[PDB]
Design a protein around this motif. Structure first.
Motif, PDB file in Angstrom:
ATOM      1  N   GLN A   1     -54.809 -10.294 -83.834  1.00 36.75           N
ATOM      2  CA  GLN A   1     -54.537 -10.305 -82.400  1.00 36.75           C
ATOM      3  C   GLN A   1     -55.763 -10.741 -81.606  1.00 36.75           C
ATOM      4  O   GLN A   1     -55.643 -11.513 -80.648  1.00 36.75           O
ATOM      5  CB  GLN A   1     -54.063  -8.926 -81.944  1.00 36.75           C
ATOM      6  CG  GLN A   1     -53.584  -8.890 -80.503  1.00 36.75           C
ATOM      7  CD  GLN A   1     -52.374  -9.774 -80.278  1.00 36.75           C
ATOM      8  OE1 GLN A   1     -51.445  -9.791 -81.085  1.00 36.75           O
ATOM      9  NE2 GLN A   1     -52.382 -10.522 -79.181  1.00 36.75           N
TER      10      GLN A   1
ATOM     11  N   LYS B   1     -56.071 -14.473 -81.774  1.00 37.23           N
ATOM     12  CA  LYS B   1     -55.141 -15.124 -80.858  1.00 37.23           C
ATOM     13  C   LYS B   1     -55.603 -14.981 -79.413  1.00 37.23           C
ATOM     14  O   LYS B   1     -55.505 -15.930 -78.626  1.00 37.23           O
ATOM     15  CB  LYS B   1     -53.737 -14.546 -81.033  1.00 37.23           C
ATOM     16  CG  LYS B   1     -53.150 -14.748 -82.420  1.00 37.23           C
ATOM     17  CD  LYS B   1     -51.845 -13.986 -82.578  1.00 37.23           C
ATOM     18  CE  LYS B   1     -51.300 -14.097 -83.992  1.00 37.23           C
ATOM     19  NZ  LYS B   1     -50.080 -13.264 -84.172  1.00 37.23           N
ATOM     20  N   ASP B   2     -56.122 -13.805 -79.050  1.00 36.90           N
ATOM     21  CA  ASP B   2     -56.596 -13.593 -77.686  1.00 36.90           C
ATOM     22  C   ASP B   2     -57.811 -14.458 -77.380  1.00 36.90           C
ATOM     23  O   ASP B   2     -57.939 -14.984 -76.268  1.00 36.90           O
ATOM     24  CB  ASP B   2     -56.920 -12.115 -77.466  1.00 36.90           C
ATOM     25  CG  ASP B   2     -55.694 -11.230 -77.573  1.00 36.90           C
ATOM     26  OD1 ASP B   2     -55.846 -10.036 -77.906  1.00 36.90           O
ATOM     27  OD2 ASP B   2     -54.577 -11.731 -77.328  1.00 36.90           O
TER      28      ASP B   2
ATOM     29  N   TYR C   1     -58.441 -17.385 -78.649  1.00 33.49           N
ATOM     30  CA  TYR C   1     -57.986 -18.758 -78.459  1.00 33.49           C
ATOM     31  C   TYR C   1     -57.347 -18.943 -77.090  1.00 33.49           C
ATOM     32  O   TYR C   1     -57.587 -19.954 -76.418  1.00 33.49           O
ATOM     33  CB  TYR C   1     -56.999 -19.150 -79.559  1.00 33.49           C
ATOM     34  CG  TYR C   1     -56.288 -20.456 -79.280  1.00 33.49           C
ATOM     35  CD1 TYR C   1     -56.944 -21.670 -79.433  1.00 33.49           C
ATOM     36  CD2 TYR C   1     -54.965 -20.475 -78.854  1.00 33.49           C
ATOM     37  CE1 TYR C   1     -56.301 -22.867 -79.174  1.00 33.49           C
ATOM     38  CE2 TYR C   1     -54.316 -21.666 -78.593  1.00 33.49           C
ATOM     39  CZ  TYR C   1     -54.988 -22.859 -78.754  1.00 33.49           C
ATOM     40  OH  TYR C   1     -54.348 -24.050 -78.497  1.00 33.49           O
ATOM     41  N   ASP C   2     -56.525 -17.981 -76.665  1.00 34.33           N
ATOM     42  CA  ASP C   2     -55.879 -18.070 -75.360  1.00 34.33           C
ATOM     43  C   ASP C   2     -56.884 -17.974 -74.220  1.00 34.33           C
ATOM     44  O   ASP C   2     -56.687 -18.595 -73.170  1.00 34.33           O
ATOM     45  CB  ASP C   2     -54.820 -16.977 -75.218  1.00 34.33           C
ATOM     46  CG  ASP C   2     -53.571 -17.263 -76.020  1.00 34.33           C
ATOM     47  OD1 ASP C   2     -53.288 -18.449 -76.284  1.00 34.33           O
ATOM     48  OD2 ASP C   2     -52.870 -16.297 -76.382  1.00 34.33           O
TER      49      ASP C   2
ATOM     50  N   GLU D   1     -58.097 -21.256 -73.346  1.00 35.72           N
ATOM     51  CA  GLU D   1     -57.107 -22.085 -72.675  1.00 35.72           C
ATOM     52  C   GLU D   1     -56.849 -21.643 -71.239  1.00 35.72           C
ATOM     53  O   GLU D   1     -56.028 -22.260 -70.552  1.00 35.72           O
ATOM     54  CB  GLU D   1     -55.794 -22.073 -73.467  1.00 35.72           C
ATOM     55  CG  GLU D   1     -55.305 -23.447 -73.908  1.00 35.72           C
ATOM     56  CD  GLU D   1     -56.288 -24.171 -74.816  1.00 35.72           C
ATOM     57  OE1 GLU D   1     -56.223 -25.416 -74.885  1.00 35.72           O
ATOM     58  OE2 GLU D   1     -57.122 -23.502 -75.467  1.00 35.72           O
TER      59      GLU D   1
ATOM     60  N   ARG E   1     -55.764 -18.381 -69.822  1.00 32.89           N
ATOM     61  CA  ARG E   1     -54.548 -17.616 -69.570  1.00 32.89           C
ATOM     62  C   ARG E   1     -54.847 -16.428 -68.660  1.00 32.89           C
ATOM     63  O   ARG E   1     -55.466 -16.600 -67.607  1.00 32.89           O
ATOM     64  CB  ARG E   1     -53.915 -17.165 -70.892  1.00 32.89           C
ATOM     65  CG  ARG E   1     -54.777 -16.272 -71.787  1.00 32.89           C
ATOM     66  CD  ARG E   1     -53.903 -15.147 -72.338  1.00 32.89           C
ATOM     67  NE  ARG E   1     -54.599 -14.260 -73.266  1.00 32.89           N
ATOM     68  CZ  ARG E   1     -53.981 -13.469 -74.141  1.00 32.89           C
ATOM     69  NH1 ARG E   1     -52.656 -13.467 -74.216  1.00 32.89           N
ATOM     70  NH2 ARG E   1     -54.684 -12.689 -74.951  1.00 32.89           N
ATOM     71  N   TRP E   2     -54.394 -15.233 -69.038  1.00 36.68           N
ATOM     72  CA  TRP E   2     -54.762 -13.987 -68.361  1.00 36.68           C
ATOM     73  C   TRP E   2     -56.264 -13.878 -68.095  1.00 36.68           C
ATOM     74  O   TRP E   2     -56.737 -14.186 -67.005  1.00 36.68           O
ATOM     75  CB  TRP E   2     -54.321 -12.780 -69.190  1.00 36.68           C
ATOM     76  CG  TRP E   2     -52.850 -12.550 -69.213  1.00 36.68           C
ATOM     77  CD1 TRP E   2     -51.982 -12.893 -70.206  1.00 36.68           C
ATOM     78  CD2 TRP E   2     -52.067 -11.910 -68.199  1.00 36.68           C
ATOM     79  NE1 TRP E   2     -50.703 -12.509 -69.874  1.00 36.68           N
ATOM     80  CE2 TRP E   2     -50.730 -11.903 -68.645  1.00 36.68           C
ATOM     81  CE3 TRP E   2     -52.367 -11.343 -66.956  1.00 36.68           C
ATOM     82  CZ2 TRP E   2     -49.695 -11.352 -67.890  1.00 36.68           C
ATOM     83  CZ3 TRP E   2     -51.338 -10.796 -66.209  1.00 36.68           C
ATOM     84  CH2 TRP E   2     -50.020 -10.806 -66.678  1.00 36.68           C
TER      85      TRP E   2
ATOM     86  N   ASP F   1     -60.855 -15.938 -69.318  1.00 33.03           N
ATOM     87  CA  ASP F   1     -61.639 -17.065 -69.813  1.00 33.03           C
ATOM     88  C   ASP F   1     -62.959 -16.561 -70.402  1.00 33.03           C
ATOM     89  O   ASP F   1     -63.569 -17.224 -71.249  1.00 33.03           O
ATOM     90  CB  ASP F   1     -61.881 -18.086 -68.686  1.00 33.03           C
ATOM     91  CG  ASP F   1     -62.125 -19.503 -69.209  1.00 33.03           C
ATOM     92  OD1 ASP F   1     -62.882 -19.663 -70.189  1.00 33.03           O
ATOM     93  OD2 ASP F   1     -61.564 -20.461 -68.633  1.00 33.03           O
TER      94      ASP F   1
ATOM     95  N   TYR G   1     -59.366 -16.617 -87.171  1.00 31.18           N
ATOM     96  CA  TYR G   1     -59.379 -17.655 -86.145  1.00 31.18           C
ATOM     97  C   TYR G   1     -59.395 -19.043 -86.772  1.00 31.18           C
ATOM     98  O   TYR G   1     -58.741 -19.965 -86.270  1.00 31.18           O
ATOM     99  CB  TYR G   1     -60.587 -17.463 -85.229  1.00 31.18           C
ATOM    100  CG  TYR G   1     -60.595 -18.351 -84.003  1.00 31.18           C
ATOM    101  CD1 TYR G   1     -60.037 -17.919 -82.807  1.00 31.18           C
ATOM    102  CD2 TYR G   1     -61.172 -19.614 -84.038  1.00 31.18           C
ATOM    103  CE1 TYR G   1     -60.046 -18.722 -81.682  1.00 31.18           C
ATOM    104  CE2 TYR G   1     -61.185 -20.426 -82.917  1.00 31.18           C
ATOM    105  CZ  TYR G   1     -60.620 -19.975 -81.742  1.00 31.18           C
ATOM    106  OH  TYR G   1     -60.628 -20.775 -80.622  1.00 31.18           O
TER     107      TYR G   1
END
Lengths: 303, 304
Positions: free
Chosen positions: A162, A165-166, A168-169, A172, A174-175, A176, A199
């Protein structure tokens, strides 16, 4: 009453060869005893001879031979505090020393540094860090100062998936940056290693590429330092020791700080990773880039 | 096993030994003239097979080593080293370059040019032209010619005429003629320049230094004021430069060494006397309070 060139050149020879003998004894004691033994010697010296040993050396030693000698007479956390205080010269100045120390220490070591800083300079290390840094760099360094990193033995494979994944997001948008601050500062080194290999599998890149692409400046250096320290901290210090030597000037301050503070932590692992990484021993490169009594002391510290 | 009393005893023995050995080195480096320790350096190489300067580099350190090696060089060579170290870019700082070139006689400027060629395989005049700029380049090269008038006669007609020229070269509404200041301050005698300065005061009403501070700028002004102050009172110039190099917790110790060493057998005793009158405290006392360690003992010994 009579200039005797043979007399003066003789007692110069006697004095010079006496310097080498005494310095050999000093180098023998400083490099042959542990930190706790050196503390016992320093306390016994002032009791028996009525003078502080560090003060006696200040009046008879000089240069980097004196800096290393006094560094060995401090507790490792005390010399780390002196290094941090010396490196903080206002906002925008170089932050490499502050990044190196805080991103490579355990909770107990960070607590010892914060105690030494408060005692030596009558102020909290956190207050000086807040006044010397800014942005997301201030957040991560102040976070590391809390000394509450997970330091268990167990790995949570689902948590590592998890987090990967967080991370990586967060690259991008999302919710830097709050995601990298939380994962890299609070997860255990063993947990982070599982996060990094997950990762690689999920994304196809190693986490260092993503950091280099999504961050810059001192913040990128801190994230990369935390990653390097979690994967292989001996390899990190070996490279910092190598890069501090390439040149005739040589950043000898970094040379002293790493060898002294890491002596009873992972100095033997640093030497092994150094040999494997550069095909030369760390000791051989000390002789190539240092000289004088300072070289003789470092070579003894490397055994 | 680990014996704490033995290691502390061994340390006290090594510490007392370094105090004794340093006292022996300080007593010789400050108790012998430059020519006397030049014989010791060659006698040491013949008797023990090692150059004395290399033996000290391996055992001394810090500014104690810097002073020790400075005392083992001819003052021409050490002045050339100070120029080569401070020369490192077109901008940068030119303090060491102005100080040396604006305070040495013709005989000393030549010995520096000779030593600079022997030490670095380079022309000191050539390195100056690459580092300097503007009219500061033109005046420093003019001093490197070592062709300043060093006669004892004083032309009172020329002193008054040069005073009028120095005023007309700064009152021109087009621009301050810096080529005229480069002519008088560099080629006239020190005793001749004093008469030129006294005449300028009588004619204009301002001191020559007040005229320089409001008609030149930057390092060109510093070169002019250094030429004026050394021609007027060079012992007072080095007295101030020694004082200001210590006012502060940082303390420019490089300037402190360069002055005491290069002027030791020139006018150091005159510098010490002017320092006492100028600041009401001896140079030996102020060095004793702004330096520390074996570097302090060697400086105090050099001041006697």
């Amino acid at each position: 009453q009579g200039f005797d060139v043979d007399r003066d050149a003789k007692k110069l020879n006697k004095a010079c060869k006496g310097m080498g003998t005494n310095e050999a004894a000093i180098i023998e004691i400083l490099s042959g005893r542990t930190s706790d033994e050196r503390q016992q010697i320093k306390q016994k010296y002032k009791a028996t001879y009525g003078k502080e040993l560090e003060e006696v050396l200040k009046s008879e030693l000089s240069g980097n031979f004196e800096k290393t000698a006094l560094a060995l007479l401090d507790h490792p956390s005390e010399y780390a505090a002196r290094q941090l205080q010396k490196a903080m010269k206002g906002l925008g100045t170089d932050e490499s020393v502050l990044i190196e120390v805080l991103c490579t220490r355990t909770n107990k070591e960070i607590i010892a540094i914060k105690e030494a800083y408060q005692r030596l300079f009558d102020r909290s290390l956190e207050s000086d860090v807040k006044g010397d840094t800014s942005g997301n760099l201030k957040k991560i360094l102040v976070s590391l100062l809390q000394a509450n990193r997970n330091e268990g033995d167990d790995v949570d494979k689902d948590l590592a998936g998890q987090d990967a994944k967080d991370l990586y997001d967060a690259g991008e948008g999302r919710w830097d940056e709050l995601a990298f601050n939380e994962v890299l500062a609070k997860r255990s080194y063993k947990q982070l290693r599982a996060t990094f290999q997950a990762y690689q599998i999920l994304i196809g890149k190693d986490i260092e590429e993503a950091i280099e692409e999504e961050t810059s400046g001192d913040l990128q250096k801190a994230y990369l330092t935390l990653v390097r320290c979690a994967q292989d901290c001996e390899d990190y210090f070996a490279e910092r020791l190598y890069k501090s030597m390439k040149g005739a000037g040589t950043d000898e301050e970094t040379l002293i700080r790493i060898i002294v503070t890491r002596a009873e932590v992972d100095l033997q692992g640093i030497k092994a990773k150094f040999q494997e990484k550069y095909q030369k021993s760390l000791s051989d490169m000390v002789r190539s880039d240092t000289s004088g009594d300072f070289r003789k002391l470092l070579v003894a510290l490397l055994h």
